[PDB]
Amino acid sequence: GLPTMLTPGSNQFLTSDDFQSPSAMPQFDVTPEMDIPGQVNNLMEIAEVDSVVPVNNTEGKVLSIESYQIPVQSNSTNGSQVFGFPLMPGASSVLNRTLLGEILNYYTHWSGSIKLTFMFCGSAMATGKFLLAYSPPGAGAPTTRKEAMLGTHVIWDVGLQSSCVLCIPWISQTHYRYVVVAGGYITCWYQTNIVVPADTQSDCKILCFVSACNDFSVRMLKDTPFIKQDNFYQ
Amino acid sequence: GLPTMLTPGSNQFLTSDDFQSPSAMPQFDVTPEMDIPGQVNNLMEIAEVDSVVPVNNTEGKVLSIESYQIPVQSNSTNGSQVFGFPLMPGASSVLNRTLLGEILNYYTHWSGSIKLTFMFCGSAMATGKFLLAYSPPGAGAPTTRKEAMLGTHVIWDVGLQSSCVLCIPWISQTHYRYVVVAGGYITCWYQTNIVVPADTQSDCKILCFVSACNDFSVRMLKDTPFIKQDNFYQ
Amino acid sequence: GLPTMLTPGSNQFLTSDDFQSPSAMPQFDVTPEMDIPGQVNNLMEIAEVDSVVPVNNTEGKVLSIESYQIPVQSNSTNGSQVFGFPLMPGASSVLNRTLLGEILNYYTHWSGSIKLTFMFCGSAMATGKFLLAYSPPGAGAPTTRKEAMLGTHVIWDVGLQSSCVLCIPWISQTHYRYVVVAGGYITCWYQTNIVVPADTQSDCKILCFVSACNDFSVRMLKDTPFIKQDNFYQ
Amino acid sequence: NYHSRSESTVENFLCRSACVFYTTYRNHGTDGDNFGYWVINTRQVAQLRRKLEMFTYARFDLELTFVITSTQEQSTIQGQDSPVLTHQIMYVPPGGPVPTKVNSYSWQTSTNPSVFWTEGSAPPRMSIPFISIGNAYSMFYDGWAKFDKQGTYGINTLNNMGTLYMRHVNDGSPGPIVSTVRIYFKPKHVKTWVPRPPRLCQYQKAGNVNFEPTGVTESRTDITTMQ
C-alpha cells in the first residue's frame, strides 16, 4: 500500500555493503564468550611490537639466522660503515618482512614514526662507540664518517649502554604516503674500534629491532603481496 | 512514492523465517480455549519424568518385558557384577529409547545431570547389599568389586531401603556435548548375597529408572533417527 | 511486510535527480580540508571582476593585443565617433568572450546592470574631453555628437580623471532576458581633440573594462557555445 | 589529535566480503551428481587464511552471499523456452544429514536451513552464528584429536562449521543449463585473541601447517648498500 520508488542501486550486490543478513540458525544459543587472554582489537598492537630486523640480507644468509646479525669486525678502518638500509618499512627488503612491514603490506597508505632499537650482543667487557646517523629523505646516504656526524646522529657508546633506541621522525609532504616505492637512511659508522681484554677470537654482533610509535596509522586495506595461491588449497 | 531498495534476500522463501502470513479465513471466530488438564510447555517436562530403563538388553529379551528386569541371582560369587551400562542417554541402547533418550535423539546437543533410580523388587524379608559404582568418563569400567569400591559408589542395602537414587554429575569439557557417540559407566556389584528366609525358589529383580535433573537442556533440534518413512502414508 | 505501490517513475534513471549513492569506498578516511586561499562559492564572483573588453575588433587585430586598445587619434574631426558597441554581453562579439560574457554564455537567462570602465592610457600632460553616451534599447545608435549629447551621456574630461566608470541600467520587459540575440549602445565621441605639449608623435589609447553589478543573476545553465569536441580527447 | 586507526581494527581488517568458493552444477545428469557442495572452511583461500591465522583464536559469525548465474549450453535441443530457474541452497549444520544424491532425503531438510532463490532477484543471503561447543574457533591446535593416531595432529572437531549444498529446484528446459554459485564470505562480530606472526612460507595443504623453509626476506648485495 505504501508507495515506494526504484531508487537506483537496488537489487544489486555491492560487495562492500553493511546490510543485515537473515539468520539461517535463529533460535540457536551460541556458547558464551570465555575470558581468553590476549584480546587484540587493532593491528597496530601487532605493529607496536619490536621485531628483529634482518639487516644482514647478503646473498646466502637469508636462509640462516645470520641474516639478523650485524657483524662488528674485531679490527677495521675507523670511519667504516657497519651497515646501512633505507627507511622503507613496506618497500625495502630489510624492513619489509618484519611485523611492522608485514602489517604495512596489507595497506596502501601509512603514516607515523619508526622506532629502531640497536642492541649490542658483545661481551660485557667490550667497549666502543658507533655513529647511528639518520639521513632525511632526499639528502642521500652519507659516504664518510664526517658526513654522518655533520647530520643527525647519536654516539652509541657500547660500554655505557648495550642498547640504543632511535626514533625516526615523520617527514613527508602528505598526511599519508604509499607503502610501495623518499624515506631516509640509517647508517652506522665505526667511531672507534671495539676494545676488549686482548684475548678474544670471534666477533661481536648487533641486533636490530623495528616498531611503530603511537602515532602510526594505515589507511587503505589491500591484498598482501606475499601470499599467493594458484587455486583453492582443497 | 517512498523510495526503497532491493535489500538482497527479498522475494526468497527462507524456510526458517518468522514472517506474518495472510489469513485465509479472517472474520472467522475460533472456539475459545478449554481448560484441558495437562498443559505442557516444554519437552523437559517429559524428560524430567522417570522412565523404566531396559538394562536386560540381551538377545531374545528385547521383545519381552524381561528386558526391564535386572536379574539378581539367589546364589553367586561375591563381588560379581549385577549389571553395567555406559552413561550415553542418547547413544547407548540401554538408555536410548527411554523418555529421556527419546527426547535427546530429537536434538544435537545436550547438557545436564542424569538421575538414576534403582528399585529392588524382591521380598520384604529379603536383605542384601549392592555397590552402585559410578566411573567418570575416560576412567574405564571397573573389573572387580574392589575397583568399584575405591571409586565413587554407594552401599545400597536392600533391607534398609528398596530404592536408591543416584545423581550422575555433568563432566564434560564443553557446555554441551553431542547426543551421538566419553560419558561414564554405572556398574552394580554383589557386596553380599541376597539373604531370605531359607525357603524361596525364584530370583529377585531390579528395576531401573532414568530421568533428567533441573539443569537439563538441549540445543539443536534435528530429525529423530528412529521413525522412517519411504513416502507419504496416504 | 509493509505494503508499497509502484509509484510511476521508479526504476528510472532521471539524470537530474538528487538520490543518495552507495559509497564504493566506505570506512575510508579522506584527508582533511586545507585552508587554501581563494575559496569561490559562486560564478558571479568571477563575473563581478573587471575584464578588458576587446573593442578594436577590426579584422586582423583579434590575433594581437591591439584588439583591446581603442585608438584615440592625434587629430580628427570634432564630433567624430571614437568607438561604439551594443550592450549585448552574451551576444555581441565585443563583450562575448570577456569574463562576464564567458559566464553568461554558460546560461540561458540573465539579468542585472553592466559596469563599464574606460581608462585613458595617454600622457599625464594630455587633456581632452569625450562623450560617453548610452542609448536605451530600441532607440538606435546616435549618428552625430549632438544626438549623443541630447541623450544619456557623461563628459569624460581626460585632464581631470584618467578613468570613467559607467553603470548601464537594466531595461527589459521581463525579469530575465535570453543571453542569445534589444540591449542598447555605448558610443564615444570627440568632444574636444586631445591636447598635448605640442611635440608628440604616437597616439593615445583607451582601455575598456566590463563587469557585473551586485544585482546580477543567471538562471538556466546550458552548454557554452565556445568549446567543442569531436570525441573524447583520449 | 592522532591519526585515526579505524580501518586498522580487527573488525575492519577481517570483516571484508571475499569470494571463497565457486562451483558449477548441471540441470541434467547421468547420476545424481547435479549438485554443488562446499564444506565451510577458512583455510582454502590464501589471503583470508593468512589474515585469520594472524591470530590464534577467533570468534565470528559467517555471513554468506551467493551469486548464482545460469548459462544455456551447446545445441541439439530446440524450442527451449525455459521458465524461470529456482535454486535451493541448503545449509547443513554440524552433525546434520549430508546428501549424497541430488534428490536425497536430506534435501527435504527437516532441520537443515535452506533458502530458495528465483533468478533475477537480489542474490540470496544467510548468516551462520558462532557454532562451536568450544568458546572460540582455533586456527591453530598443538594437539591430537586422538593421541593414539599420529595423523590426527592439529585436528579438532570444534572448527567444523557445516556444509553448504546447492542445486536446481527445477530444470526449466530439457536442454543443458549449468549454474555457478560463487559463494562470498564475510565474518561479522569478530573477536580475536593471541596475535601471531604472519605466515611467511607459502601454504601447501589446507589441513596442514607444513611448509618448505623459506628465507626470512629478500636478499641484497651488501650490508651497506642502498638500492
Contact criterion met (CB below 8 Å) for B112 and B212: yes
In this structure, what are the phi and psi dihedrals at residue C93, rounded to the nearest 5 degrees?
A: -65, -15
Residues β-bridged to residue A4: B2
Taking an 8 Å cut-off on Cβ atoms, the answer to whether C26 and A4 are in contact is no
Annotate C19-64 with DSSP letters as a single string: -----SS-S--PPPP---S-----HHHHHTS-EEE-----TTTTTS
Whole domain around residue B159: which residue ranges?
1-234
Chain A interface includes B3 (CB < 8 A): yes
Partners of A164 in beta bridges? A118
C-alpha A15 chain-centroid distance: 32
Question: H or E element: which one contains D62?
Answer: strand D55-66
For B10, the closest chain A residue by CA position comes to A11
CA distance C161 to C148: 21
B4 touches chain C (CB under 8 A): yes
Q: How many CB atoms lie within 10 A of CB B74?
A: 13
Method: cryo-EM
Of C123, C195, C128, which is closest to residue C157 (Cα–Cα)? C128
Q: Which domain holds residue D99?
A: 1-227
- Cβ separation of D124 and B6 shorter than 8 Å? no
Q: D-chain residues within 8 Å CB-CB of A19?
A: 125
Q: Which residue of C has its CA nearest to D16?
A: C27
The distance of Cα D11 from the centroid of its chain, to the nearest Å, equals 19
Check if B220 contacts A (Cβ < 8 Å): yes
CB contact under 8 A, A22 and B18: no
For residue C186, give Cα distances in angstroms to B9, B33, C150, C183, D225: 70, 98, 14, 10, 75
* Of C14, C218, C188, the residue nearest C103 (C-alpha): C218
Owner of C-alpha cell 593416531: D149
* % helix, strand, coil for chain A, step of 5: 10, 30, 60
CA distances from C218 to C109, C174, C192 (A): 6, 13, 40
- By Cβ distance, the residue of C2, C21, C28 closest to A2 is C2
What are the residues facing D92 on neighbouring strands?
Answer: D163
**Phi–psi pair at B10, nearest 5 degrees:** -95, 160
- Strand ranges (DSSP E) for A6-140? 39-40, 51-53, 69-72, 81-86, 109-111, 114-120, 129-135
Which residues from chain B sit within 8 angstroms of residue D110, using beta carbons? Answer: 222-223
Element (H, E) at A95: helix A93-96
Cβ D5 vs Cβ D134: under 8 Å:
no
Q: Please tell me the distance from the alpha carbon of residue C143 to that of residue C129, in angstroms, as a whole number.
A: 18
Q: Side-chain half-sphere of C118: how many Cα atoms within 13 Å?
A: 26
Rg (alpha carbons) of chain A, rounded to whole number? 24
Say yes or no for a CB contact (<8 Å) between C19 and A7.
yes
Report the phi/psi class of residue B46: left, alpha or beta, with left for phi > 0 and alpha for psi in -120 to 50: alpha
* Contacts (Cβ under 8 Å, ≥6 apart) of A141: A84, A86, A135, A185, A187, D226
Element (H, E) at D51: helix D46-53
| DSSP sequence for chain B | -EE----SSTT-EETT-------SS-S--PPPP---S-----HHHHHTS-EEE-----TTTTTSGGGGEEEE-SS--TT-EEEEEES-TTTSHHHHSSHHHHHHTTBSEEE--EEEEEEE-S-TT-B-EEEEEEE-TTT----SHHHHHHSEEEEEETTT-SEEEEEEP---SSSSEES-----EEEEEESS--B--S---SPEEEEEEEEE-TT-EE--B---SS---SS---
Distance CA B8, CA D121 (A): 8
D181: left (phi over 0), alpha (psi -120 to 50) or beta: alpha
A111–D3 CB contact, under 8 Å = yes
Report the C-alpha gap between B170 and B180 in whole angstroms: 17
Nearest to C184 by CA among C139, C149, C150: C139
Q: Cα-flanking dihedrals φ and ψ of residue D51, to 5°? A: -60, -40
For chain D, the C-alpha Rg in angstroms (whole number) is 22
Chain A neighbors (3+ CB pairs < 8 Å)? B, C, D
D190's enclosing H/E stretch is: strand D183-195
* Among candidates A10, A45, A60 on the partner chain, residue whose Cβ is nearest the Cβ of D195: A45
Which residue, among C224, C223, C210, C221, has the nearest Cα to C110 in the 3D structure? C221
Query: Residue A23 has which C-alpha cell?
Result: 539468520
Which residues in chain C touch residue A22, judged by CB atoms under 8 angstroms apart?
none
Contacts of A35 by beta carbon, 8 Å cutoff, 6+ apart: none
**How many B/C residue pairs have CB atoms within 8 Å?**
8
Which residue of chain C has the CA closest to D8?
Answer: C27
Sheet of C185-190, strand order:
C81-86, C185-190, C129-135, C152-157
B8/A4 Cβ within 8 A: no
Query: Using only C-alpha atoms, what is the Rg of chain B?
Result: 24
B22 touches chain A (CB under 8 A): no
CB A180 within 8 A of CB A144: no
Distance CA D153, CA D207 (A): 10
Distance (Å, rounded) from C-alpha D204 to C-alpha D216? 18
C30: number of Cβ within 10 Å: 7
B-chain residue closest to C9, CA distance:
B1
Tally of CA atoms within 13 A in the half-sphere of C94 that contains its CB: 18
- CA of B6 to nearest chain A CA: how many angstroms apart? 4
Q: Does B181 touch chain D (CB under 8 A)?
A: no
Mutate to test the interface with C, among A2, A5, A19, A174 (most CBs of C within 10 A): A5
Residue D148, phi-psi category: left (phi > 0), alpha (psi -120 to 50), beta (remainder)? alpha
Residue B6 with chain D: CB contacts under 8 Å: 121-122
Residue C193 to residues C75, C119, C166, D219, Cα–Cα distance (Å): 7, 17, 21, 87
Give CA separation, A82 vs A151, A159, A202, B165, D56, in Å. 17, 17, 16, 81, 38
Beta-carbon separation of D10 and A43 below 8 A: yes
Report how far residue B206's alpha carbon sits from residue B121's, in angstroms, rounded to the nearest whole number: 6
Residue-wise burial string across C39-62, b where 16 or more C-beta atoms lie within 10 A, e elsewhere:
eeeebbeebbebbbbbbbbeeeee
DSSP letter for each residue of A120-182:
E-S-TT-B-EEEEEEE-TTT----SHHHHHHSEEEEEETTT-SEEEEEEP---SSSSEES---
Please name the amino acid found at residue C30: V
Q: How far apart are CA C11 and CA A128, in angstroms?
A: 78
Secondary structure of residue D18 in the 3-state scheme: strand
Helix or strand or coil: residue D151?
helix
Q: Give me the residue from D95, D114, D126 closest to B180, CB to CB.
A: D95
Look at the block and give the residue holding cell 577590426: C58
Kindly determine whether residue A7 and residue C3, on different chains, have CB atoms separated by under 8 Å.
Answer: no
Q: Let me know the angle formed at the C-alpha of B217 by B211 and B218, rounded to the nearest 5 degrees.
A: 105
Q: How far is CA D206 from CA C192, D43, D50, D155, D158, in A?
A: 100, 5, 11, 12, 16
Interchain CB distance below 8 Å, C19 and A6? no
Distance, in Å, from the CA atom of A216 to the CA atom of A219, rounded to the nearest integer, reads 10
Evaluate whether C29 touches D4 at the Cβ level (below 8 Å). yes
Query: Residue A24: which of D45, D113, D200 has the nearest Cβ?
Result: D113
B110 within 8 A of B90, measured Cβ to Cβ:
yes
Residue C24 in contact with partner chain A when CB distance is under 8 A: yes
Q: Is B231 on the interface with D (CB under 8 A)?
A: no
- Cβ contact, residue pair A175, C31, below 8 Å: yes
Across the beta sheet with B109-111, what order do the strands follow?
Answer: B177-178, B109-111, B217-218
* Burial of C15 (C-beta count, 10 Å sphere; 0-12/13-18/19+): exposed
Q: Which three cell numbers stand for residue D172?
A: 526449466
Residue B95: all three cell numbers together: 538408555
- Check C27 against D7: CB less than 8 A apart: yes
Comparing alpha-carbon positions, the chain D residue that sits nearest to C28 is D7
Strand bridging mode C217-218 / B217-218: unpaired
Q: Is A204 exposed, middle or buried (0-12, 13-18, 19+ CB in 10 A)?
A: buried
Closest CA of chain C from A50, distance in Å: 27
Cα distances (Å, whole numbers) of residue A220 to A61, A72, A107, A110: 34, 40, 5, 8
**C165: its cell numbers:** 566608470
Which of the other chains make 3 or more beta carbon contacts under 8 angstroms with chain B?
Answer: A, C, D
Which of D72, D64, D73 has the alpha carbon at shortest distance from D22? D64
8 Å CB contact of B12 and D116 = yes
For D19, the enclosing helix (H) or strand (E) is strand D18-21
Chain A positions touching B19 (Cβ under 8 A) are: none
H-helix or E-strand containing A10?
none
Domain count, chain B: 1
C-alpha span between B119 and B209 (Å, rounded): 8
Which residues are CB-neighbours of A58 under 8 A, at least 6 positions away?
A: A67, D219, D220, D221, D222, D223
Residues of C with CB below 8 A from D6's CB? 27, 29
Whether residue D115 and residue B14 make contact (CB cut-off 8 A), yes or no, is yes
Whole-Å CA distances, D184 to B11, C102, C152, C220, D18? 20, 52, 78, 47, 5
Using alpha carbons only, what angle is made at residue D119 by residues D116 and D122, rounded to the nearest 5 degrees?
Answer: 85
Chain B CB contacts of A5 under 8 Å are: 1-4
